[PDB]
Structure 1
């Protein structure tokens, strides 16, 4: 084996999605994120457990129990 002749296993490497590089790329102009809206914007997207202003599942359900000191 030479330093050139080495090569990786097939399927190991996968290039990567490069957004905004023409029509032919596929993704390109709106880099796979649609037209307008909060999610299209830079630094967009809502925080975790946010259901559009509806009271979230992790708040409409009651909280229960106590963490045991002895179990630790």
Structure 2
């Protein structure tokens, strides 16, 4: 029965994949808005 075991309900959440398409919700800008220092790779200010 190793093909009948199954995880709990709610334990494995999907994982945001950014940059794929328009339907996914997080495409083009991946959830990081328009230009600026925060929309840049490595970008962000210090603590």
Could you give the per-residue CA deviations for residues 4-35 of structure 1, whole angstroms, max 9, x where no partner exists? 00000000001100000000000110000000
Gaps of 5+ in 1: 47-72
Gaps of 5+ in 2: none
TM-score by length of 1: 0.62
Q: Which has the larger share of helix?
A: 1
TM-score by length of 2: 0.93
Structure possessing the higher relative contact order (Cα contacts under 8 Å, 6 or more residues apart): 2
Displacement of 1:41 in angstroms is 0.3
> RMSD between aligned alpha carbons?
0.4
